[PDB]
């Protein structure tokens, strides 16, 4: 149900067993988990300028 766009890469975060996704200071989504692999993946915006 969480929609968006960006680049998905592996990160080193350590989520608790009841955590699903994390947010930064400005309350933007930067990390999610695979519902079928339970790994930690970071989200980065695509290039622009």
């Amino acid at each position: 149900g969480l929609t968006g766009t960006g680049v998905l890469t592996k990160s080193n975060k350590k989520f608790l067993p009841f955590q699903q996704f994390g947010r930064d200071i400005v309350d933007t989504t930067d990390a999610v988990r695979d519902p079928q692999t339970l790994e930690i993946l970071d989200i980065t915006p695509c290039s622009f300028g």
């Binding site: 009841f18 955590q19 699903q20 996704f21 994390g22 947010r23």
Partner: peptide, 26 residues
Amino acid sequence: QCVNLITTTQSYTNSFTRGVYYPDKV
């Protein structure tokens, strides 16, 4: 049987800050 071995003491504690829980899963 009506085994009522407990009563209301109305006593409390003034050195507790324990009522904290996680509000969400973020």
